[PDB]
């Protein structure tokens, strides 16, 4: 019966609407733009308050791995979907589960404030502008799905004399089409996934392209092992077990091996200076091809930028530059929340399970999609929303404010705790762990041990095979029937789209390639 306000109709938004309908609540979803998707909807223009995309973007997480747990991608969809097709997939999810009804478009959420009675009612005043007409309205609970990656980050201090530059420059955000660097001399600043992608793209046309890193980065292909989507090999329960039950110094060294096995990162000048602190690995299939053919060349860091030129640290050659692209990442904020509710300190909101603000008397505000997992946002946001709406409904319950506030402070001090691939800093989180924590909380986590006795086929395909989101809706509330069939047909769909030419499962694979061989008994 509870009335839920959903802020934004992005991936996270749609999941909330769906998860609301599903647990029989009344969702009202306020989108500020004129259609759903947020990011995944490519427009020509940059809309403010709404994440922006370049025309060439394709998913850096694979098809059967980054779909809503109860809604696979079509069979005819490529293993890594372009922004065009990703949007269609979202408009399909929206159509299917009848979500379009509940969305009000061109509706900025100007403010969400506790009701005066909140301490007893647990309600919210949601002020919403539409055709320049403010309109207050009371809601029983609010789910915020603004995500991040809309607010650009561009620290001009950090690039001395960029003011003096007489060429043109801009943030990745403002980038749409590669025409603009036809024959120009291009410097892409920051080896962000966006950076690398643009640099590579520029190389197609531009006379010269330089990609200025700072730390450097590890770089891997979508293609990965045997033409298998990397994630369908890497993000599997079994592997995730190995990594997490194995000392940081090893796994990090062990990764460098599996990253260099493509190309010696040292020779290409990508090698991160600081090992043992593995930043998000870059996902680009072209880069090396560009470096070896000299269409893109990695440069160490901007030392200073001149009238019509740039100088890099430890780099004697001053390089003439026409265009500078700052792929320097994005910040995030909540203008409609007050500081009393959500903090936004050090790229982090201080939320219990990166959702609930963990001091509020009543748990009736949820933040969906403010997390940086080791896997796709799509299922995380959804699996987030499942455990969320059931707190708002009161079917599940948060532990005491005393337990949440102190547990949050443990993750907030970014304490490495060694062993498992140290989870960086801000919104750090293992994909499988965080999902299993939440599936537990709503009693959807399948009993794998039991599974093995009852159904052994499925049991193994879930542990050794790719941790596909289907295996979330296998048992518990929201259980999907097709789930089992979907999990076992996993690879059949993954190969139908690549195998466009005939000739005359794929359980585990070769991630732990010099590992399972190296760490097998020395029987004395
Ligand atoms: C180039 C690129 C590629 C990516 N590829 C992948 C990928 O392959 N796989 C993956 O899992 N993730 C990927 N991501 C991450 C991406 O953030 C998610 O995939 C997805 O876009 C999450 O959507 P969201 O709901 O969190 O937020 P968004 O997509 O940003 O949607 C937020 C929505 O909220 C609306 N809004 C904002 N403020 C207000 C307000 N005050 N009132 C009302 N509405 C408001 C906006 O208009 C927008 O529609 C990628 C990101 C980028 C930039
Ligand atoms: N499909 C794709 O391939 C694709 C494309 C774009 C975006 N994405 C998604 O979007 C997310 C974030 O996108 P993004 O790449 O724009 O952000 P990002 O990955 O955070 O990139 C920002 C980069 O800018 C550099 N940087 C940051 N602060 C700096 C400073 N003060 N001075 C100099 N350099 C600085 C860093 O690289 P250096 O350390 O190298 O300088 C950093 O990695 C990704 O994780 C991914 O999910 C995916
Ligand atoms: C195979 C050798 C394992 C050596 C383990 C010794 C190192 C311990 C360091 C801390 C890491 C945690 O260690 C780990 O805990 C639990 C056991 O309760 C198991 O973890 C498991 O949890 C759930 C079941 O509840 C599974 O869905 C998940 O896929 C799996 O990771 C791992 O098999 C074990 O390795
Ligand atoms: Cl452009």
Numbering used by the authors: 2 to 505, 512 to 531
Question: Which statements did the authors publish about this structure?
Answer:
We were able to successfully crystallize AncFMO1 and to solve its structure at 3.0 Å resolution. The asymmetric unit consisted of two dimers, and the dimerization observed for AncFMO1 is the same as for the dimers documented by the other AncFMO crystal structures. Alongside the well-conserved NAD(P)H- and FAD-binding domains, known as the paired Rossmann fold, AncFMO1 includes a large 80-residue insertion, two small α-helical triads that form the hydrophobic ridge that embeds into the phospholipid bilayer, and a large transmembrane C-terminal helix that drills into the membrane. The oxidized coenzyme, NADP+, was successfully bound in the crystal structure and two glycerol molecules were found located near/at the active site. AncFMO1 possesses a phenylalanine and a leucine at positions 149 and 150, respectively, creating a hydrophobic and wider pocket at the base of the active site. Furthermore, with Leu150 not being able to create hydrogen bonds, Lys373 is not tied down and can extend outward, toward a glycerol molecule situated below the diphosphate moiety of the NADP+, thereby further enlarging the active site. While the other AncFMOs crystal structures portray the 2’-phosphate to be extended out into the solvent, in the AncFMO1 crystal structure, the 2’-phosphate is tucked inside the NADP+ binding domain. More specifically, the 2’-phosphate establishes hydrogen bonds with the side chains of Arg280 and Thr214, and the peptide of Met192. Nonetheless, unlike the other characterized crystal structures that conveyed closed active-site cavities, AncFMO1 exhibits a significantly porous active site. First, the residue changes at the base of the active site (Leu150, Phe149, and Lys373,) create a hole in the vestibule and a leaky cavity. This is in turn emphasized by a large loop (residues 416–425) that further expands the substrate entry point.
Mammals rely on the oxidative flavin-containing monooxygenases (FMOs) to detoxify numerous and potentially deleterious xenobiotics; this activity extends to many drugs, giving FMOs high pharmacological relevance. As such, we hereby reconstructed the mammalian ancestral protein sequences of both FMO1 and FMO4, denoted as ancestral flavin-containing monooxygenase (AncFMO)1 and AncFMO4, respectively. AncFMO1, sharing 89.5% sequence identity with human FMO1, was successfully expressed as a functional enzyme. It displayed typical FMO activities as demonstrated by oxygenating benzydamine, tamoxifen, and thioanisole, drug-related compounds known to be also accepted by human FMO1, and both NADH and NADPH cofactors could act as electron donors, a feature only described for the FMO1 paralogs.
